[PDB]
Amino acid sequence: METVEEIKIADLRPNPYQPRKHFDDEALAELKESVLQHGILQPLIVRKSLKGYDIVAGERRFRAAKLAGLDTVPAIVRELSEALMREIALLENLQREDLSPLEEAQAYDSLLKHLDLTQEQLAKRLGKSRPHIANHLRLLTLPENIQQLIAEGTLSMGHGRTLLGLKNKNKLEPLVQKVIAEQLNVRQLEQLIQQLNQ
């Protein structure tokens, strides 16, 4: 039976097989904020070495914990060959599916209702910006069929966002059919919507 250990930040060493080459400061601030709200929800995977503990999965969490003022992170300590460490460094990130834009928006909407929160309060609680939450919730004001098209992938989310800018909704559904039939890009749609609006 494995345990989750609290490992001191001073004892942690970089992932020797780190596949991430860029650490976005904005995204780390989001993770920091979430850690301040909920703590680290997911234990790191680490491997005990002579000098300390090498991270196998969790470098962002580690950086977020430091930003948040924590002195330890939760971790599962495993004995692993170099080959397993190389594989798992990738697989922990590779073998997962993110939520779609619409699944995210529906989640925000469900939390607003069941947690009884404003969008500002939800952004704080989730560690996301207020514009990020508002832009996703706006997708839920599009016609049902267009939401379906976006989910099915027949329309991009970028098209969805651009469609919100249309003044006269009488042209909305013909505009979507044109986008699809002509495989228009988002910039072409922006330009059509500007004229229609004017």
Residues noted as catalytic = 59
Residues 150 and 139: beta-carbon distance below 8 Å: yes
Per CB under 8 A, the list member of 16, 48, 87, 171 interacting with a copy of itself is 87
40 binds, among a copy of itself, Ca ion, ligand CDP, none (CB under 5 to 8 A by kind): ligand CDP
Query: Is 7 one of the binding residues for Ca ion (CB under 5 A)?
Result: no
Query: Is 182 one of the binding residues for a copy of itself (CB under 8 A)?
Result: yes
- Of 47, 38, 60, nearest to 16 (Cα)? 47
Query: Is 101 one of the binding residues for ligand CDP (CB under 6 A)?
Result: no
**CB 172: neighbour CB atoms within 10 A?**
17
The DSSP 8-state label assigned to residue 99 in this structure reads P
Query: Is 74 one of the binding residues for a copy of itself (CB under 8 A)?
Result: yes
Per-position x/- string for 26-55, each x denoting binding to a copy of itself as judged by CB under 8 A, each - no binding: -x--xx--x---x--xxx-x----------
Sign of the torsion formed by the C-alpha atoms of 25, 30, 35 and 41: negative
Sign of the torsion formed by the C-alpha atoms of 179, 181, 185 and 187: negative
Query: Is 20 one of the binding residues for a copy of itself (CB under 8 A)?
Result: yes
Per CB under 5 A, the list member of 12, 15, 108, 155 interacting with Ca ion is 15
- Of 9, 103, 101, 111, nearest to 53 (Cα)? 9
| Cβ proximity to Ca ion, 15 vs 34, nearer residue | 15
